[PDB]
Paper text:
FrpD is a highly conserved lipoprotein located in the outer membrane of all meningococcal strains, and it does not exhibit similarity to known protein sequences from other organisms. Intriguingly, the FrpC1-414 fragment exhibits a very high affinity (KD ~ 0.2 nM) for FrpD, the other protein expressed from the iron-regulated frpDC operon. Hence, the similarity of FrpD fold topology to other proteins was not sufficient for establishment of structural homology, indicating that FrpD possesses a novel fold.
The protein crystallized in two alternative crystal forms, belonging to the hexagonal space group P64 and the orthorhombic space group P212121, both accommodating a single molecule in the asymmetric unit. The refined crystallographic models of FrpD comprise 224 of the 229 residues, with one N-terminal and four C-terminal residues being disordered. Both FrpD structures are largely identical, with a coordinate root-mean-square deviation (rmsd) of 0.56 Å over the 224 aligned residues. A single disulphide bond in a right-handed spiral conformation is present between the Cys150 and Cys227 residues. The electrostatic surface potential map revealed that the FrpD surface is highly negatively charged, except for a single positively charged region located at the β9 and β10 strands of the structure.
Author numbering: 44 to 267
């Protein structure tokens, strides 16, 4: 199948969609979520190619700008208001834009991850969400006094594990948190490092809030 880059730069992110075929599953993505697939200083954007069915692929990476509001963090495609952040991200990666990796694949998250955390001495914590179980590990380790990890596990039909962790190793450094999310959403595995430019510790509400938008977004692509 032939590739083309014949869509102009977005103002809303919703001007065009690109249609993908994942082993027979149709995904229809608003092109503003596809910042990685542009040419000429992001003036040419990936497009559907007439004559061809749909890009037949195994995986796609969407990109979202994350923004503080008074109702919380929201995720946005490329638009005229946030464009400078995406352009900085495309230039060197140093802006508040995250990559979400979507693959059509069997879910490989076990239902026994929580058991394994507890088996290793991670502590079970009360959770702000009924659908999540929450875990924390802040053991004193002699050669790393800054160790701190959180885990949030969603089960049911669309499981997820969220790991938020302090990366600081030296006394001379500031605390530096980072997050990984592995999940399964309606036949896709969806893996990402959210809040990529955030060094500060995040609450369960900020993490789960982010992921809830990721699910809704991914489900919007297949729903049509």
């Amino acid at each position: 199948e032939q590739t083309s880059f014949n869509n102009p730069e977005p103002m809303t992110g919703f001007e065009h969609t690109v249609t993908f075929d994942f082993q027979g599953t149709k995904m229809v993505i608003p092109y503003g979520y596809l910042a990685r697939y542009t040419q000429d200083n992001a003036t040419k954007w990936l497009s559907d190619t007439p004559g061809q069915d749909a890009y037949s692929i195994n995986l796609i990476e969407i990109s979202v700008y994350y923004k503080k509001t008074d109702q919380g963090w929201v995720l946005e495609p490329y638009n005229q208001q946030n464009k400078a952040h995406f352009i900085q991200f495309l230039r060197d990666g140093l802006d508040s834009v995250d990559d979400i990796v979507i693959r059509k694949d069997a879910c490989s998250l076990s239902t026994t991850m929580g058991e394994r955390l507890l088996t290793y001495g991670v502590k079970k914590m009360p959770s702000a969400y009924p659908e999540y179980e929450a875990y924390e590990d802040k053991r004193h380790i002699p050669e790393n006094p800054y160790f701190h990890e959180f885990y949030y596990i969603k089960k049911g039909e669309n499981p997820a594990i969220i790991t938020h962790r302090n990366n600081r190793i030296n006394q001379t450094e500031e605390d530096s948190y980072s997050t990984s999310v592995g999940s399964c959403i309606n036949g896709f595995t969806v893996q990402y490092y959210p809040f990529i430019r955030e060094k500060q510790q995040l609450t369960q509400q900020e993490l789960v809030g982010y992921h809830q938008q990721v699910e809704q977004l991914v489900q919007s692509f297949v729903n049509n």
